[PDB]
């Protein structure tokens, strides 16, 4: 048989519900399970799905240069093959031989999907533009002036055509405003200003951090590009600590920071959470970097070419995409992903009403204290 070493990470390596009532390869399930099944079908051998001890993927010590993880297993002969979501690198290739990637990915951006924003104190103006509002105001005051002129500058045929045209105007304005507001309320299209990493780079309102110990951190540290260097400078000087100790910690932070944070992680896990509950997440932008998960095998081996060819066979057959849609979307829980009107949407209306009414009262009072005062004193 073969020593199929891997690690517990979903939806690649999962324990069936009846794991205690089972003992064997039937225990584990997920993506890499079916992957290894297809590989065995192509190569025709027996295997035993083992697991890593240190619960890590693979690396070496800085001082003792000892390989920890599946790398330590394969290099030191403790295993024979590692069908796991292993990341390809220069260091790992220098000691062993990978296969052509079967799943390409890259860093992504997880956030909470845009929820209904604040009622927008001055929202009743959103359906139209400030320019149109000021134009309407000026039209009103100008028509008032004109009507004032046809009373003193002349005793009508002036208040008739003016009345008709003003009726037309106000009619069309009413209709336009109502239609636009109805369209706004009927569909409620939600969007956010974050469609890339450049957006997060320019802005500073919503924060963004990464696991305080991992490959993404090292990458952002490196990559001296005008953009990612800016983000590294930001996160190196940013309070409170945007960094976290585990993934679920960052996910929960995003969930409790609806519009104040955004996490970075492998696009695969991001799409995963995007389909898991409570379905309050979403991936934005595209893969900033480019990486690929590939099989591993010791430097001197025999299956190297076999698996290197089987991976391409599958990728061309249209099977890896099948398994992905199975373990991400078909299994997906969020396959799906009106209200009354509150006062906070129209508060500005009453504010302006009261302001204008108080102004009118003050005007009338000063006019009175002037007119009557002059008529009495003189």
């Amino acid at each position: 048989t073969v020593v199929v070493t891997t690690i517990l990470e979903s939806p690649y390596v999962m324990m069936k519900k009846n794991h205690e009532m089972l003992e064997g390869n039937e225990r584990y399930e997920g993506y890499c399970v079916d992957l290894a099944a297809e590989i065995a079908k192509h190569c025709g051998f027996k295997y035993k799905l083992t697991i890593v001890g240190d619960g890590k993927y693979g690396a070496r010590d800085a001082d003792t240069k000892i390989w920890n993880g599946m790398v330590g297993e394969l290099v030191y002969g403790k295993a024979d093959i590692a069908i796991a979501p292993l990341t390809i690198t220069l260091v790992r290739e220098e000691v062993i031989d990978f296969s052509k990637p079967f799943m390409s990915l890259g860093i992504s951006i997880m956030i909470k999907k845009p929820q209904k924003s604040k009622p927008g104190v001055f929202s009743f103006l959103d359906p139209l533009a400030y320019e149109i509002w000021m134009c309407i105001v000026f039209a009103y005051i100008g028509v008032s002036v004109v009507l004032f002129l046809v009373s003193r500058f002349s005793p009508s045929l002036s208040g008739r055509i003016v009345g008709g045209v003003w009726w037309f105007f106000t009619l069309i304005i009413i209709s336009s405003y109502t239609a636009n507001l109805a369209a706004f309320l009927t569909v409620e299209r939600m969007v956010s200003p974050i469609e890339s990493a450049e957006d997060l780079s320019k802005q500073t309102e919503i924060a963004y951090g990464t696991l305080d110990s991992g490959s993404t951190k090292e990458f952002f540290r490196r990559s001296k590009i005008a953009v990612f260097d800016k983000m590294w400078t930001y996160m190196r000087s940013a309070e409170p600590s945007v960094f976290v100790r585990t993934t679920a910690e960052g996910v929960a932070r995003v969930r409790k920071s609806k519009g104040k944070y955004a996490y970075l992680l492998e696009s695969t896990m991001n799409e995963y959470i995007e389909q898991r509950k409570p379905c309050d997440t979403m991936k934005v932008g595209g893969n900033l970097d480019s990486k690929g998960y590939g099989i591993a095998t010791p430097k001197g081996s025999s299956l190297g070419n076999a698996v290197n060819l089987a991976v391409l066979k599958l990728n061309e057959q249209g099977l890896l995409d099948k398994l992905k849609n199975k373990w991400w979307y078909d299994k997906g829980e969020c396959g799906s992903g009106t209200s009354a009107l509150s006062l906070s949407n129209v508060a500005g209306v009453f504010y302006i009403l009261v302001g204008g009414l108080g102004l009118a009262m003050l005007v009338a009072l000063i006019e009175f204290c002037y007119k009557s005062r002059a008529e009495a004193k003189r």
Partner: protein
Amino acid sequence: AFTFAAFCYMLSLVLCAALIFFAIWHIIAFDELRTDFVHARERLRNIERICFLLRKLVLPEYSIHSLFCIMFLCAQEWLTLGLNVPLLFYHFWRYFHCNADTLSYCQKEAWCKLAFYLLSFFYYLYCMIYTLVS
């Protein structure tokens, strides 16, 4: 943080502004009538004018105060409404309760009414304030 009460309070204080102006104008009118108390014909015409104005400034009091009362009643505010009730009771008492004698007490009545309406204006302001933020 609106609660429908900030609007009511600001409207009430907007009306109380005109109320304060009417009260101050009555102060000054009674002061000038005290000073005064065809020159006789001119004085008669002036007092007729001022009394006509005063009689025309009667309904506003009742209207605005009943409005304050009913507004705070529908707003369910019993912390200041009970304070406006006594003035309505006195207004209804004036009917079967009410020119050198009438002004003798009307002076102090108008002074205290000014202070009362001003106090109520400030109270409405502070209430609108600590109701709009919460």
